[PDB]
Amino acid sequence: SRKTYTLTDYLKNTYRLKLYSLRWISDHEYLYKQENNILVFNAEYGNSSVFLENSTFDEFGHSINDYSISPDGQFILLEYNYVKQWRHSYTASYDIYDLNKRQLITEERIPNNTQWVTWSPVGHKLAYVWNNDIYVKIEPNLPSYRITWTGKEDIIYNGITDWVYEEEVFSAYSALWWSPNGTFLAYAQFNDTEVPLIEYSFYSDESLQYPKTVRVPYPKAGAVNPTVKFFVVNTDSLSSVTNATSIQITAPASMLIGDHYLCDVTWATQERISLQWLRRIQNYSVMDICDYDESSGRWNCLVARQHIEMSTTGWVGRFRPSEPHFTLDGNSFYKIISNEEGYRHICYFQIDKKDCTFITKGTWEVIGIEALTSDYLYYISNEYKGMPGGRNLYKIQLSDYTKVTCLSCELNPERCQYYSVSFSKEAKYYQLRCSGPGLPLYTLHSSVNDKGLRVLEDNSALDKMLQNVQMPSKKLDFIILNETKFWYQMILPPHFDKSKKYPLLLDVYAGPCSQKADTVFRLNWATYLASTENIIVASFDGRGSGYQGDKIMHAINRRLGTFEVEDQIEAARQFSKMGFVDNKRIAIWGWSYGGYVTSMVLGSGSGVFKCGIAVAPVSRWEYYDSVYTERYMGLPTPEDNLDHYRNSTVMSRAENFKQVEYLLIHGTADDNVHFQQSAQISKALVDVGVDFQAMWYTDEDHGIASSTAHQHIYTHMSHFIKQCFS
Amino acid sequence: SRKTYTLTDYLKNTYRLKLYSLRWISDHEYLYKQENNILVFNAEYGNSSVFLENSTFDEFGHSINDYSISPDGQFILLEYNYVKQWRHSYTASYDIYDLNKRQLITEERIPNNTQWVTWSPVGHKLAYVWNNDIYVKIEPNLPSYRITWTGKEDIIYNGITDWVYEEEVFSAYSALWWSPNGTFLAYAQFNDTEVPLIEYSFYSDESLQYPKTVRVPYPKAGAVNPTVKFFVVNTDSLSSVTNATSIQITAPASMLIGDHYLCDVTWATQERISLQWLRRIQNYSVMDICDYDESSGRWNCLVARQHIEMSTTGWVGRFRPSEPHFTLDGNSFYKIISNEEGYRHICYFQIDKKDCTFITKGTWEVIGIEALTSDYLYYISNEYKGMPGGRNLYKIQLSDYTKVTCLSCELNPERCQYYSVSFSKEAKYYQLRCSGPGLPLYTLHSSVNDKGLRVLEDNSALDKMLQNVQMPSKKLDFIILNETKFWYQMILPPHFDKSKKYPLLLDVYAGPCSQKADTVFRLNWATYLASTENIIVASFDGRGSGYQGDKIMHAINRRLGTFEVEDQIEAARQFSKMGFVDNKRIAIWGWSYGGYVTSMVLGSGSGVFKCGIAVAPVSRWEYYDSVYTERYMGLPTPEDNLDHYRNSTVMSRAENFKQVEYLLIHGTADDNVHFQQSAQISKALVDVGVDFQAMWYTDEDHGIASSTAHQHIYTHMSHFIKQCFS
């Protein structure tokens, strides 16, 4: 009877998930965007009022892609002429609209091609980066004060991250941090002078006669890394007749002895800032807590307030050392660190005490600290039901660590096992966001008694829609391997009949600290495969996976391309013996790290898989960036880990591809996993006489996300899967 | 019964064609190489003697890939450390071995990375190019005289051609011409200073961490072209204390007025040299005949000895103006030029007479002038049987143009209809080389009475081998289109049964002045398709084809991508109505220009073809080099031919690919047809939502000729054809 979730439904997004993206502007109100206008809501009662009409900018002349209201409510930042760069970076044009006089500020406007803009935390001050230099605007209509003068494209970055810092550490283009009340503006400076450049052709539109060459400072494993410097400027000291003086915060000496990185910056108070550094060998990290010296104007980082965080089993943090959450006075803070038992939990520190006290414990982990009041600490964890793939909001009484309360567990057990949260300014209210296993559910609550105020969005519309279609179900469970249990998931075709034998597709990523087996509800390609082609799509989290402790996560330390791929093969081997799996039709595919694993698997010689697809795969670790690779592989030198760097390439397994059908895909403008990686794979396959299918995507990057390329790759991959199974 | 010509037989070359490559060292003897040693033969009797034993260089230390014996027989040039560059260019190392003293010359040796070396025509002088500069060596063991000092990589080329001159005009790296007795050394100089650079990535071996960027001066259609200068130096005036003086030969004034090219250089006598120039608009060409002035030391080119050659229907020459063949005294010459009727024939000129006299005529063409004696002129033509695809050696009495004799026609009518020839120094003897329709046959003759002396090679070995295999046959014939008849050929499966219906593959090239329909015997991929897969492989020569007069060849003037592709579609349409052709299984494929035509055809919307394969295709003429493109397309400017340049792209036809199965293939290091061309095609296909198969070959160039890549592409293409037909 009736329809199924088709490929076209996925590519054309016929069944959409409704969201409820709000933005707290205070401890009592939040702004709520809409395709037309922006409304302001009162958390307590729910009543609203238009903040600015959808018509205020009808004849602005440009297509605005984003707004940013100053903390004052007095101004609105208008963003247009958006030009995407990397995963987070982009340039655009900006105009400021005065809400008090309802006029568009025309004087001393923010230059075009601005790399980054941000209001101060409280008033309406502005800090932005242009041509790699920092500028501060005390008043929207007043001239800008140039803070830095050393900016130089591809060389010196002031206030913005270079390629690797953007992608691997801060996950942001921004490299500036305003102090709590906006008095100080802290920023980092990156020097890429000796960083090697990755070069690749960009064809551009047909009209371009000669292909251009794109080059970007990109440090590959073991190469020269960018250096970093940190500064803090007092925005209340700007003149216009004198150049602003930036106080530098150097060291630590234990870091200066060699290559290192700035990995975190968090203000503690109006005059206290914490900085976290990491050695190139991401084994050891140091936290500095620097206080402003009223009489010297300098920033002192008292050794005594330095906290060392290191690891003997691997690297520090999931992807980097976690951030600290200070108490109002800044004399103490909480932060997630690995247990003595290897599990990440919240540890309570005294800025001057060397040993911290854990306040949570157990065979589970704290995903993140969400909010801190003088009374309670709110955090997300996968403790409930001992399910590593579930997430719940908990709160712990700071005066009695024995009193912990789960705020999300029982709201709707059936429908919700995965939550994210958004607290208001003073944590007076919070919005819970349930993303599965059922349809996304957004609700509002008040912290005084954790009372449920109301449902903001329940996706009732989509719900009525999906009951007219034969949707697939999701099975979350585990299998045991050497005493240890590992979770997996399966998107089961509708009317799943354990009697019948289904072809199985193994959806894999499996990079360090990853999780592909969870309770999240998704509408993707896998949905179509199960619903329309009656294909079972499975995912498994083996050695290397995260949120299950360092014993599992650090198992692939200095040894990438080993256990995580073995466990993948093993999981599929067990699946093929389940009764409803046609072991003669088992495939595997992945993207980026998932492309690497997929290739390593297909070239393992296990014969377990018939065909596989690798999209933008890593082929050899010496080709990927230093910050990521080295974190798990160390340095590619003979004295260090060169041997394993060379033992874990995809091309060395070239010969074994004779037994499988392989589809290799890659964007030619991939700035992240360079086309080079797939170029070497295809060449190793040719040199060995192995036939395979290939597809390049001209000018597409790592996401192969343009509207047309996206539909084309999934369409192309569907034909390949259908053919390999039918 | 028994085997067939398999794909593996083609890729592994199990059935080899024997050759007989000889080299005339005089009018009576020729050298004959062998995998081991070199022998010297006496043409008159056939007796031989070893010239140099296969052991003379056992402990040389290097792998010699080629030898060159000086005209004296006194020295041997040894070539090793061969590093290929473009289609003709390459660098290598050289050593000279003295045959008189049987020693290896160790003093003043030729530098490594030498770009070009050549003995003088008579003695043992040497001229070579290193680091783009010319050097002359009067004696093998004496210091070299540097002739030029302006050489500069990618900028100034002395004695060697730049990229476009190598590929499009001289079909050689060499740009130096010794005078008949070695007294003068003429050379060209190319300046690429403002020539744009094509840039592309070269991945190299896996060990390379960062992909390198190759850039080469390459003028695309309409771009800035390289400039050229011509010089002549007297090698008998070299000192060692003074810099050699090179006399320049400039003009013509009718050429200097704008962009032009040097397209031919031919010495007439010891002191007379002829030069041919061509305007950027390859409509008009001028020939200069310059005499050495004994008392001025200069070279005078007397306007009166200038011969203009232009065309009103198209460009000049088949690919460039033909070369002249002077009479012993140099006061007259013969050269192939287009008729009043449009057919190319030999015209007799008086260096001082404005009008030449044709000595051959008819609805056929002279392919080339092979030899000239004071008595006879020997030439190759396709006159015999009125077959444009056949070739025969003829000789015409210079005293009675009415007396022409075919020297090859009746030697073996059945087996031989395609001949090439090689005369000795004074044309006392000639070697005929039959390449089809039967197995290659090499024979020797004496010019006195054109008597057949003996068979040098008859491929008797391969003959016995091929009778144990089910080989295909070749049908050469024609079809009529608008009064005019056009020839085609078909490789018919063994035991061809006109009753049965066979799938047909259209092998196409069809660039201007091409011929894919001939009587040549070939052992290639097409042989396998017909023998093993029972596929008919056809080729058709329509408008644009050569050797049939300018009315057919110039039909696509300034209009590439029109009639040559239309006729291709039309030829296939007629084939599909022949009775033994399954019109439901007709494919088309080609390489380079053939890739362009194949794409244009598949995107025509004719629906005649089910699938097609394009290898390294041109996609839009603005992306190809100027010298070639402009010769047929003019300049891509609005005032000229920009409109047709834009109407003849493959991407504009993108939408029509929905009806066909397309396989796109290209080498990423193609320096000739840049990967860019296929990158734009694939992108235009993605933007329109058309699915297709693709395959890139990392680091392979236009030939995709490495041992592994070659076998891989044909293997990959075979799977595609088999699937499209079965």
Ligand SMILES: *C(N)[C@@H]1CCCN1C(=O)[C@@H]1CC[C@H](COc2ccc(C(=O)O)cc2C(C)(C)C)N1
């Ligand atoms: C493919 N997946 C390639 C090949 C292995 C490493 N690859 C990466 O892309 C790595 C993995 C981690 C990092 C990307 O990190 C992020 C991207 C996006 C966000 C986000 O919040 O949107 C966050 C991250 C972090 C927090 C750094 C994991 N580069």
